[PDB]
Symmetry: C3
Subunit: 114 residues, 3 copies
């Protein structure tokens, strides 16, 4: 799985161990070994949400399977809670794009997962 | 809707109110309330277009519906004009990826839009 | 085609001409004129792969066609080798998302490719 977070929150506001917490939490959430989870956090972004530049986040989760109505809702609960708790970002100011990737469309280690 | 712009144009070249202009213009364009529009601008990027590092942009627009042949062309007219006017980026050096997101695949406020 | 690379590798570690090499190599690979190839490299990223912050990369290749099982594997061979050679990133720590874009969903020069 691959999780990317973009936020206008400053770098100094991201607590230590955030990436590790994201990795653990996502491995738990997806049922995938943490050795496969990729996390990426991009702070200090020039962004706005609903016209306001109040703290906000635009993220995405790419996974080969594990994507669906019920699962995505759990993911949002989780991810929004972490951003609200760890980054002080209001959940109503967070967008998360879900992507169910086909194994043949994910490249890794000189090949694909197909 | 979610609009992201990546450009090699320096930060100093992005005029004040650009994010607000993008928000307004996109709300008009999509017929969605501006309180739902998320805009993100990433300047000073290390990029090239057709081998040249002349001013250029790589963007994407994610929307739940409002995506199709005719609409996408309007969007491009608009977005390219703004980048050409506001950022001095030649429209033939701008790429915009359109994404018709399924409501169940967009997370927000501890859940999805499903 | 559009290729984006995100890595934790410092800027100073990206060799000169890397973007041009990526452009050339991708044009060869896809059979598309290099005047259409867009490349974007984002170094010094705050990321982790499998819990480790050892050098790694999260990339994506968007193309209108030229995407499939066999082609994607070639792309991965190529891209991973360049990252391993040029950036010293282990291929088993690189993810590449492949996207077969529909022409009507790609905006360029005030319109779409439809
Ligand atoms: O989804 C998975 O199970 C996986 O192991 C890896 C993955 C990594 C990045 C990506 O964009 C899609 C899938
Ligand atoms: O498309 C919409 O109408 C919407 O309200 C929200 C949205 C949020 C994130 C995203 O990646 C795409 C759409
Ligand atoms: O696919 C092509 O032939 C092309 O010329 C351009 C392209 C640009 C951006 C993108 O996301 C996909 C394709």
């Amino acid at each position: 799985p691959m999780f990317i977070v973009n936020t206008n929150v400053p770098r100094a506001s991201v607590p230590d161990g955030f990436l590790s917490e994201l990795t653990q939490q996502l491995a738990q959430a997806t049922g995938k070994p943490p050795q496969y989870i990729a996390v990426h956090v991009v702070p200090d972004q020039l962004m706005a949400f609903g016209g306001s530049s109040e703290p906000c986040a635009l993220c995405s989760l790419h996974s080969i399977g594990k994507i669906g109505g019920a699962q995505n809702r759990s993911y949002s609960k989780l991810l929004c809670g972490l951003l609200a708790e760890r980054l002080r970002i209001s959940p109503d100011r967070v967008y998360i794009n879900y992507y169910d990737m086909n194994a043949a469309n994910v490249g890794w280690n000189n090949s694909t997962f197909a």
